[PDB]
Design a protein around this nucleic acid. Structure first.
Lengths: 553, 86
DNA sequence: TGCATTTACGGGAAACTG
DNA sequence: TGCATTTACGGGAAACTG
DNA sequence: TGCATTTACGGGAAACTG
DNA sequence: TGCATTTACGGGAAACTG
């Protein structure tokens, strides 16, 4: 809350008051050297037409007041140093980290407004200290003597006031909108060759002489030494328009920003790399959007620069699954140090951490996360029966290695099940009709509930296509549990044709010459079919009305 | 062959950076076979090496040199230790 | 304002190259 | 010879312009 | 060949700097 | 203010040179 905010805020007011105060001291010293100027110029030449002492004890004030002002700036400059080091190395940086998790999902970033203010104030303040150190240069260019406080301190002050300004604006040059392909907006670091993508750059020092003065250029792969070093590094060019100027218009509420839309990638086919298909790394190699500008002004020549997160470049959205996986791991295990190498030797991760992303994945697409009992099934497919919340999962196990006894990676499994929900199961899954994830052990042992006629929902473990199914229970006459029952898993193909709910309504099972049954009555604990999934049902010389229907035996 | 440090402030020896002394460095070599019509440039490089001041350190260090030489093919991953494996 | 036409992209499959 | 990646095109929907 | 003298390094502790 | 690293020096052993 206002734990550090209130601290930092008090320190910026502090700076702002200590600039005002210096300015009253400049005005009273601007007066007292004119008064002496008047009284000395009528007294030096005076015989052309009770003791007292005005010329000996008052002149002292043109020393004393110059020492008080000069010492009083240094005190301000020291204070601005501390305020600035907190602002830069704590307040921005921790907004950053926040950002890198609003990529991969989770809690949303707050605005930049609060940070802009602190920036801007600390920058107007240092602009005012610049002018006052030039009114001091002007008083020295009128009257100078033996020990002049503003001749020993003139250059050390000027040099510090700039050294501070530079550091201040250079850190103000940030990326507001991490690059993204508009059509895939929860997936914002994965580029495709020959779609358009968009970025936006934000400057924090909202000054108004910085309007139509900064033209921000976009580069690709600038100063990436993996190109030379790694074997098989692709190269690419950007294609939209690169050069924009940064304007206070467009983006409302000031915000000296630039949003470049219509950015594209194309590959530079020049053999060259020769596309070695025995190098280090596949496509999980990382790349990097770079930006760059320069604040030109009378006496002021600052070079700005900044850089996107690591980005991944693909050809086909057959890839983008895999890719995203990259972008999770990275954004999950890493501070910022553009480790473009990461994946040569990629770390492990803590099942207590991974878990919270896995949640995030579904919570981002939909309106409902992975609850506890569902993570337990997953960690256990990753770890093994001892699913400590400290166990380490290796990046292979996650993404490029077949699980226990199946022919597909563990992400590439979840990747499909998410998809299925996003296009065929939103309602049932925002309204928690699906158990989804469960082991075909603690299913049976939770169906020794009720009426020979309860059924879960499950996602199937044995597809790669992601395919939902249902499980239900009978009475076998032996005085116990049934062999239970579950059905061949219902994938997209089927669900394309008739909706999953509607499968449910009208499930059959049949015989030669026997009336057909309906073994689905009660969903989990006790809920009548025709209640849970009531509300999704579709609808309730002259053609006759047909349906589709799912049927066993 | 000897090492000496180039004290020029410069780095300013930040004692809040990434990595301690397990940073890796690298001996590089280089020559050229000149001959009538033949002008070849040769080059090669040591393993990653670790540089210390005092053999109060060399324990720690060795530890570096185990991990690296144990988990790695050759690709001079000079970064390793920013994000070192298991 | 509405309709015709063009565009941009997703997705599947074949073509490429190491 | 097989697998990894890219390219090509069809369809569908959105965008554009008269 | 043997002895004197100097050298190089290991190790501990204090000094440095962020 | 504390911790990380470097530097400084003493001792011991080896090397060097007459």
């Amino acid at each position: 809350m206002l734990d550090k905010q209130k601290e930092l805020d008090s320190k910026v007011r502090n700076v702002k008051d200590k600039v005002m105060c210096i300015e009253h001291e400049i005005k009273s010293l601007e007066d007292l050297q004119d008064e002496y100027d008047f009284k000395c110029k009528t007294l030096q030449n005076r015989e052309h037409e009770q003791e007292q002492l005005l010329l000996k004890k008052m002149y002292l004030m043109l020393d004393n007041k110059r020492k008080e002002v000069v010492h009083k700036i240094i005190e301000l400059l020291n204070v601005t140093e501390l305020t600035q080091n907190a602002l830069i190395n704590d307040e921005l940086v921790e907004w950053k980290r926040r950002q890198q998790s609003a990529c991969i999902g989770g809690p949303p970033n707050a605005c930049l407004d609060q940070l802009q203010n602190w920036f801007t104030i600390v920058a107007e303040s240092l602009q005012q200290v610049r002018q006052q150190l030039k009114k001091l240069e002007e008083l020295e260019q009128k009257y100078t003597y033996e020990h002049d406080p503003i001749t020993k301190n003139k250059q050390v002050l000027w040099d510090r006031t700039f050294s501070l300004f530079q550091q201040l604006i250079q850190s103000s040059f940030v990326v507001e909108r991490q690059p993204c392909m508009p059509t895939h907006p929860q997936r914002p670091l994965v580029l495709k060759t020959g779609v358009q993508f968009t970025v936006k750059l934000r400057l924090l020092v909202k000054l108004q002489e910085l309007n139509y003065n900064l033209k921000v250029k976009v580069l690709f792969d600038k100063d990436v030494n993996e190109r030379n070093t790694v074997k098989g590094f692709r190269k690419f060019n950007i294609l939209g328009t690169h050069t924009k100027v940064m304007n206070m218009e467009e983006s409302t509420n000031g915000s000296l920003a630039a949003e470049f839309r219509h950015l594209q990638l194309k590959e530079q086919k020049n053999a060259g790399t020769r596309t070695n298909e025995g190098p280090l790394i596949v496509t999980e190699e990382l790349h990097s959007l770079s930006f760059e500008t320069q604040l030109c002004q009378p006496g002021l020549v600052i070079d700005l620069e900044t850089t996107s997160l690591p980005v991944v470049v693909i050809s086909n959205v057959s890839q983008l699954p895999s890719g995203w996986a990259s972008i999770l791991w990275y954004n999950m295990l890493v501070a910022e140090p553009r480790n473009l190498s990461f994946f040569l030797t990629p770390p492990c991760a803590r099942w207590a951490q991974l878990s919270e992303v896995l949640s995030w994945q579904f919570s981002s697409v939909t309106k409902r996360g992975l609850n506890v009992d569902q993570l337990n099934m997953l960690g256990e497919k990753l770890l093994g029966p001892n699913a400590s919340p400290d166990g380490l999962i290796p990046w292979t196990r996650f993404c490029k290695e077949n699980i226990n006894d199946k022919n597909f990676p563990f992400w590439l499994w979840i990747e499909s099940i998410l998809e299925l929900i996003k296009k065929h199961l939103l309602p049932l899954w925002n309204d928690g009709c699906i158990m989804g994830f469960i082991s075909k052990e603690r299913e049976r042992a939770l169906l020794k509930d009720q009426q020979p006629g309860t059924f879960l929902l499950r996602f199937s473990e044995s597809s790669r296509e992601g395919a939902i199914t249902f499980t239900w229970v009978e009475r076998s006459q032996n005085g116990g549990e049934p062999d239970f029952h579950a059905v061949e898993p219902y994938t997209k193909k089927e669900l394309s044709a008739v909706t999953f709910p509607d499968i449910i309504r009208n499930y059959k099972v049949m015989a030669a010459e026997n009336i057909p049954e309906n073994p689905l009555k009660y969903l989990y604990p006790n809920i009548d079919k025709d209640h849970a999934f009531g509300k999704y049902y579709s609808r309730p010389t002259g053609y006759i009305k047909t349906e589709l229907i799912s049927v066993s035996e």
